[PDB]
Amino acid sequence: ENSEKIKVNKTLPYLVSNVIELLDVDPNDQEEDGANIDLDSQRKGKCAVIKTSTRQTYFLPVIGLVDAEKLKPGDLVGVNKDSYLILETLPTEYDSRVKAMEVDERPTEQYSDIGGLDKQIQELVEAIVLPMNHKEKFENLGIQPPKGVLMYGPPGTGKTLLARACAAQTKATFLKLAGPQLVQMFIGDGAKLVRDAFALAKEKAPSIIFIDELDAIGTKRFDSEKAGDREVQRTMLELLNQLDGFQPNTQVKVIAATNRVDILDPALLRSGRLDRKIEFPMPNEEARARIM
Amino acid sequence: LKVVSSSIVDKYIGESARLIREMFNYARDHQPCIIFMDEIDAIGGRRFSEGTSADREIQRTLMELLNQMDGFDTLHRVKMIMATNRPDTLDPALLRP
Amino acid sequence: LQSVGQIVGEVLKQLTEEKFIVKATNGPRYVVGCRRQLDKSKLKPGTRV
Amino acid sequence: DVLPPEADSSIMMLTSDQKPDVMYADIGGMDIQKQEVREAVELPLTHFELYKQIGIDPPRGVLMYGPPG
Amino acid sequence: GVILYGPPGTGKTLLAKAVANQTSATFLRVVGSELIQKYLGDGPKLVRELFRVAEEHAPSIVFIDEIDAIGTKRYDSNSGGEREIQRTMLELLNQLDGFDSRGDVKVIMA
Amino acid sequence: IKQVEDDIQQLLKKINELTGIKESDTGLAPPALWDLAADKQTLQSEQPLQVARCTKIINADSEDPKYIINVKQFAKFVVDLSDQVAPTDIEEGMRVGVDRNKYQIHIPLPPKIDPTVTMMQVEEKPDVTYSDVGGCKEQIEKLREVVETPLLHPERFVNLGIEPPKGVLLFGPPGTGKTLCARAVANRTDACFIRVIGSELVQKYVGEGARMVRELFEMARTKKACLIFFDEIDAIGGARFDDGAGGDNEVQRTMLELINQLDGFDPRGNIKVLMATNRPDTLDPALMRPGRLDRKIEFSLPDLEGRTHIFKIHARSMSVERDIRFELLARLCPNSTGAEIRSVCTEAGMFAIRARRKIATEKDFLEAVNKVIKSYAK
Amino acid sequence: LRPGRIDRKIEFPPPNEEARLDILKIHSRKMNLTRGINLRKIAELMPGASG
């Protein structure tokens, strides 16, 4: 009898909602007002809340149809618009799962097929690939791995091609993030996008987060008047703190590249920040021949 | 009680104001408590072109910080730690303890 | 599932012992009643309901 | 039916308080400004009539500029 | 199009008014300074609306009242200065060197 | 007489449509009308998107049968079991598919590589073909090899194992035939000429500018073989390396975003790019650099023989008496580009018209040089 | 400044001793004070100063 009952509410249109507060004591809270003239906002929510997407908040007492401990303060739940009870638990993460996150599960590049790039390859292989595997050596030493790499030099040298070859080789997921993409019209949106990027990364482990730009994620201005450009700064700072906030993960590998030759926007002092320096070597005649 | 500054800024009306206030309220009941603000620069900005683009939010948050001080509230056992990268956007009321 | 939904309100003020001001979120501001099974001691000035 | 408007809350902080508080501390030494405010605020409320008799209106708005700290 | 040049309208202005009666088509007189706006979108949208309006009313006479903004080109094609005045200046050109009129639009410049 | 007939025309169409709407009304229906401006014997069943408009969304899937994908401010509701068949392609929404945002919702059709909503000028085939050639002669020869030849005979290039460039650059003064040349090939080459004015792309609010660049490229990809004509990209073309100083950052972001798409994972396809600069110097090294820009096609001071070809073009319209020869005058005349050469000729016809003669004369020509020599110097 | 985009351009004099006497009189009609005062003296007390 119960099985048919629940099923009917699932067939769409259906309300998904977001649980803001887990808690299961101290009911009552408040939403909406009267009118007349003079304007100051107010909002509230307690006990357990779900805020449904007409922008309405609801008070429910818990059911065992899904367990509340298994639920979180910030979880998507599937609700039966009748009594407003949580029929089911939905997956993890809210809102956008990044508005343009490109996943490359297996790149098509290999570095064993291009020689004459050689000097750069030697350094690259040694940087990324070696900590994951060689972990046992690291553990005995007691030093830890890096987490970020910097590559600088004249663009368009096929610097990126080698990054795509290492990703193919290593068996991490390659995640391409472009720096103007994080920038939005919308206010504070990017920090959520980066936090999410990080979170998706945690689940995927290993991963390479490839960050194009250190110009649209490498400015923050040291100008006195800089307030208007606050958005740009907030995002950049967010990345740096997200790195500084905790103590490293060996689930993420981050590689950063420039797109205009050399700026100063400090992001390299710790190794939880960037610490490895790859330089493009000026062209060697022998190398050019080899490529040819 | 840990603050990440760019989660306080949102694209919704009066959330920064609602959030800070409640947060401050919770500290007085619960006292003693330390509120650690890491890299305030969502509070850092006195404007110059005198916008209200995103800039109205800057004014919203700043005003809240001052409102708590200007009030009949006393951080009774409440401690505040701020982190700033470059200091130049301080208010004239902060110089005074 | 048969059980009734719970709307959140705050009391603005108490008008009569039968009338209350609540600013609800099914609709707008309303004047509402209250159960005669409920205490007078719970009437307290400015509370969540 | 008619009912009067009522409310008195905010979560952006708007208080009507039945308890006055404090006094001037080491923040004092207001005296020059004190005298000007004594004339502005207190007299038109206390005595409306005196101002009408001479024929001159009271104030409606006052501006304070300076840091609130 | 033609260019009428002299110390502000003592006969420039006179001659234009006179000519519209003669010619027996719609006269539209635009104040050119007014195209200048210190707002990123506004100024370009206006010049493109100005051209849009011409096309409907064709044949038509365009009287362009003098600007400050036709005075500056420099040797850059855009600058870190007041960008907009040259951004606008370019679109005036694009409209002109894109499409030639024998009579659909007649231009009087001042 | 006409009126009787017109009334009969409304009425006959009305009865058939009333029956069809009664029927379409049941079970609801997509965005609200039919507009025809193609044929009815070719009807798509893929429609463009980047957001999912839903109105009903009837379908077949086992986990539910009327699944929906939104992201809209009110009703952003989604599938109740992730990644289960929802839209029915573009049923009951006409662009229902998937949201760019994502909520682990089914993709029968992508949120990228689509024409979607736009603000675009697409300009069907011109009519012009040779109108300032003579010193524009070199520019023609090269442009055919770059643009036309790959589309005409692609199969040849593959055997060799050569791939042709993706962009060419135009410089020198516009309206001299630098401009004409791009339309003249556009008409010959038979591929859509898409005109974007870079200056327009510039917007009052950030992130929008990037969005535009992106939209252009998605459309460009779908259609394969197209020409993107960039009108005087320098507004969002280079000048610039200074890294901001107050909204020199916003224009720089657009410039950098274009690079990403070009240097990126995309490949060329059959897509051709024509760039237009004043003096190429302005532009930044990133814009110049190979792996996007390779050939720069130039303009030039036209040789004497050249001038004559342009005059030769003009002389078919213009009533003449050929017993005199324009080339001798032309050697004596200032050396100047193609546009002044047509203009002196054009001036020449007027003098006739005042003279009350119908044929050209030697006399007309003498006069033109004095004005023109004055006009450059203002 | 180009003539005929002009018509009249009119001077407004800087204030004077005669002038000051009579503005004072206008103002006084708004409020009540003693009768038997010589105002004439009072304007004179004033140096130059705005209306």
C-alpha distances (whole Å) from F273 to each of A25, B64, F182, F229 are 65, 53, 11, 6
Phi-psi domain of F238 (left: phi exceeds 0; alpha: psi -120 through 50; beta: other): beta
Positive/negative CA dihedral, A57, A62, A63, A66: positive
CA distance F158 to F172: 34
CA distance A35 to C30: 11
CB G15 within 8 A of CB G50: yes
- Residue given tokens 């000429």 in the structure block: F193
Considering only CB atoms, which residues of chain G are within 8 Å of chain D? Answer: 30-32
Residue C14, helix vs strand vs coil: strand
- Does A206 sit behind a cis peptide bond, omega within 30 degrees of 0 on the bond before it? yes
CA distance F163 to F142: 16
Residue type, B3: V
- Give the residue among F292, F263, F271, F180 at the shortest CA–CA distance from F217: F271
Task: Report residue F65 as tokens.
Answer: 């049968």
A219 carries a ligand binding annotation: no
Give the strand pairing for A253-257 and A276-279: unpaired
CA distance F193 to F198: 15
CA dihedral of F350, F353, F359, F361, whole degrees rounded to 10: -60
Phi-psi domain of C28 (left: phi exceeds 0; alpha: psi -120 through 50; beta: other): beta
CA distance A181 to F207: 8
Q: How far is CA A158 from the centre of its chain?
A: 26
Enclosing H/E stretch for B4: strand B2-4
CB F178 within 8 A of CB E75: no
- Pick among A44, A94, A182, A234 to test the B interface (most B CBs inside 10 A): A234
Interfacial A residues in 203-242 facing F (CB < 8 Å):
212-213, 215-216, 219, 221, 223, 228-229, 231-232
Please spell the DSSP secondary structure of chain D, one letter per residue.
----------SS-----S-------TT---HHHHHHHIIIIIHHHH-SHHHHHHTPPPPS-----S---
- Give the residue among F134, F145, F132 at the shortest CA–CA distance from F180: F132
CB E85 within 8 A of CB E104: no
CA distance F85 to F68: 9
Residues 6+ apart with CB under 8 A from E42: F204
Instruction: Answer whether B29 touches A (CB < 8 Å).
Output: no
Give the strand pairing for F226-231 and F272-276: parallel
E10 carries a ligand binding annotation: yes
CB F59 within 8 A of CB F108: no
Give the strand pairing for A56-59 and A75-80: unpaired
Burial of F286 (0-12, 13-18, 19+ CB in 10 A): buried
Give the distance from residue G26's alpha carbon to the nearest chain E alpha carbon, in angstroms.
45
Task: Report residue E106 as tokens.
Answer: 């007649």
E6 carries a ligand binding annotation: yes
> Is C21's CB within 8 Å of D6's CB?
yes
F174 → chain E, closest CA residue = E97
CB A194 within 8 A of CB F214: no
E88 carries a ligand binding annotation: no
> Is C25's CB within 8 Å of A82's CB?
no
CA dihedral of F60, F62, F65, F70, whole degrees rounded to 10: -100
CA angle F145-F149-F150, nearest 5°?
115
Considering only CB atoms, which residues of chain F are within 8 Å of chain A? Answer: 57, 64-68, 74-78, 80, 82, 100-104, 112, 205-208, 210, 241, 243-246, 249, 252-253, 256-257, 259-260, 263, 265, 286, 289-292
CA distance F347 to F331: 19
CA dihedral of E72, E74, E80, E82, whole degrees rounded to 10: -10
Enclosing H/E stretch for C21: strand C20-23
CA distance F52 to F60: 18
F232 → chain E, closest CA residue = E90
Instruction: Give all strands (DSSP E) within chain F, no chain letters.
Output: 121-123, 167-170, 192-197, 226-231, 272-276, 293-297
Instruction: Give all strands (DSSP E) within F41-147, no chain letters.
Output: 121-123
Q: Give the DSSP letter of residue F302.
A: P
Task: Report residue C44 as tokens.
Answer: 């307290």
Size of interface D-G (CB pairs under 8 A): 8
> Is C1's CB within 8 Å of A30's CB?
no
Strand order in the sheet with C11-14: C11-14, C20-23, C29-32
CA angle F264-F270-F274, nearest 5°?
80
CB A50 within 8 A of CB A87: no
Give the distance from residue A72's alpha carbon to the nearest chain C alpha carbon, in angstroms.
21
- Pick among D9, D11, D13 to test the B interface (most B CBs inside 10 A): D13
- Give the residue among B56, B67, B42, B64 at the shortest CA–CA distance from B13: B56
Residue from the list F66, F76, F253 with its beta carbon closest to the beta carbon of A11? F66
- F and G touching (3 or more beta-carbon pairs closer than 8 Å): no
Inter-residue long-range contacts of A281-289, CB under 8 Å, 24+ positions, other chains counted: A281/A119, A281/A120, A284/A119, A287/A116, A287/A117, A287/A118, A287/A119, A288/A116, A289/A116
Residue from the list A11, A184, A186 with its beta carbon closest to the beta carbon of F64? A11
Cα end-to-end distance, chain G, whole Å: 30
- Give the residue among A163, A174, A172, A180 at the shortest CA–CA distance from A99: A180
D68 carries a ligand binding annotation: yes
Query: Subunits that touch chain G (at least 3 Cβ pairs < 8 angstroms)?
Result: D, E
A227 → chain B, closest CA residue = B45
Residue C35, helix vs strand vs coil: coil
Q: How far is CA A147 from the centre of its chain?
A: 15
**Contacts of residue C23 in chain D, CB cutoff 8 Å?**
7
**Contacts of residue D12 in chain B, CB cutoff 8 Å?**
14, 17-18, 21, 64, 67
Task: Report residue F70 as tokens.
Answer: 């939104």
CA distance C29 to A34: 5
**Contacts of residue G2 in chain E, CB cutoff 8 Å?**
7-8
Give the distance from residue C11's alpha carbon to the nearest chain D alpha carbon, in angstroms.
9
Q: Give the DSSP letter of residue B48.
A: S
Residues 6+ apart with CB under 8 A from B53: A228
Instruction: Answer whether E41 touches F (CB < 8 Å).
Output: yes
Q: In sequence order, what are the beta bridge partners of B3?
A: B37
What is the experimental method?
Answer: cryo-EM
Q: In sequence order, what are the beta bridge partners of F195?
A: F121, F229
**Contacts of residue B69 in chain D, CB cutoff 8 Å?**
68-69
Positive/negative CA dihedral, D17, D23, D29, D35: positive
CA distance F154 to F144: 14
CA distance F17 to F9: 13
Task: Report residue G15 as tokens.
Answer: 């204030």
Resolution, angstroms, 1 dp? 6.8
**Contacts of residue B67 in chain D, CB cutoff 8 Å?**
12-13
Inter-residue long-range contacts of F307-311, CB under 8 Å, 24+ positions, other chains counted: F307/F134, F307/F135, F307/F341, F308/F134, F309/F133, F309/F134, F310/F132, F310/F133, F310/F134, F310/F135, F310/F338, F310/F341, F310/F342, F311/F341, F311/F345
For chain C, the residue count is: 49
C-alpha distances (whole Å) from D1 to each of A98, C18, F171 are 53, 16, 79
Query: Subunits that touch chain E (at least 3 Cβ pairs < 8 angstroms)?
Result: F, G
Cβ-count burial A105-129 (b if 16+ within 10 Å, e if not): eebebebeebeebeebbeebbebbe
D57 → chain G, closest CA residue = G31
CB A8 within 8 A of CB A81: no
> Is G5's CB within 8 Å of E8's CB?
yes
CA distance A260 to F259: 11
> Is B10's CB within 8 Å of A187's CB?
yes
CA distance A288 to F292: 20
Instruction: Give all strands (DSSP E) within E1-110, no chain letters.
Output: 2-3, 26-31, 60-65, 105-109
CB A99 within 8 A of CB A193: yes
Strand order in the sheet with A75-80: A56-59, A49-52, A15-19, A75-80, A85-89
Residue from the list F199, F239, F282 with its beta carbon closest to the beta carbon of E90? F199
Enclosing H/E stretch for C23: strand C20-23
Helices (H) and strands (E) in chain E, counts: 3, 4
> Is D69's CB within 8 Å of B93's CB?
yes
Task: Report residue A185 as tokens.
Answer: 């019209």
Give the distance from residue A186's alpha carbon to the nearest chain D alpha carbon, in angstroms.
24
Inter-residue long-range contacts of D3-8, CB under 8 Å, 24+ positions, other chains counted: D3/C15, D3/C31, D5/A34, D5/A36, D6/C12, D6/C13, D6/C21, D7/A33, D7/A34, D7/C12, D7/C23, D8/C12, D8/C46
CA distance F157 to F149: 10
CA distance A149 to A128: 8
Cβ-count burial F169-180 (b if 16+ within 10 Å, e if not): bbbbebbbbbbb
Cβ-count burial D36-55 (b if 16+ within 10 Å, e if not): eeeeeeeebeeeeeeeeeee
- Give the residue among F183, F213, F188, F181 at the shortest CA–CA distance from F200: F213
Cβ-count burial F328-345 (b if 16+ within 10 Å, e if not): ebbeebeebbbbbbbebb
Q: Give the DSSP letter of residue E35.
A: G
For chain G, the residue count is: 51
Q: How far is CA B89 from the centre of its chain?
A: 13
Inter-residue long-range contacts of F68-74, CB under 8 Å, 24+ positions, other chains counted: F68/A12, F68/A13, F69/F96, F69/F97, F69/F98, F69/F99, F69/F103, F69/F105, F69/F106, F70/F99, F71/F99, F71/F101, F71/F103, F74/A53, F74/A54, F74/A55
E7 carries a ligand binding annotation: yes
Backbone dihedral angles phi then psi of residue A176, each to the nearest 5 degrees: -100, 120
Task: Report residue D23 as tokens.
Answer: 């006094």
CB A278 within 8 A of CB A249: no
Q: How many CA atoms lie within 13 A of A31 on its CB side?
A: 19
CA angle A250-A253-A257, nearest 5°?
160
Give the strand pairing for A56-59 and A49-52: antiparallel
**Contacts of residue D6 in chain C, CB cutoff 8 Å?**
12-13, 21
CA distance A271 to A146: 6
CA distance D66 to A207: 54
- Give the residue among B93, B2, B94, B91 at the shortest CA–CA distance from B44: B91
Enclosing H/E stretch for F343: helix F338-355
CA distance A76 to A89: 7
Considering only CB atoms, which residues of chain B are within 8 Å of chain D? Answer: 14, 17-18, 21-22, 64, 66-67, 69-72, 91-96
HEC assignment per residue over chain A = CHHHHHHHHHCCCCEEEEECCCCCCCCCCCCCCCCCCCCCCCCCCCCCEEEECCCEEEECCCCCCCCCCCCCCCEEEEEECCCCEEEEECCCCCCCCCCCCEEECCCCCCCCCCCCCHHHHHHHHHHHHHHHHCHHHHHHHCCCCCCEEEEECCCCCCHHHHHHHHHHHHCCEEEEEEHHHHCCCCCCHHHHHHHHHHHHHHHHCCEEEEEECCCCCCCCCCCCCCHHHHHHHHHHHHHHHHHHCCCCCCCCEEEEECCCCCCCCCCCCCCCCCCEEEECCCCCHHHHHHHC
Strand order in the sheet with A253-257: A102-104, A173-178, A207-212, A253-257, A148-152, A276-279
> Is A60's CB within 8 Å of C4's CB?
no
CA distance G38 to G21: 11
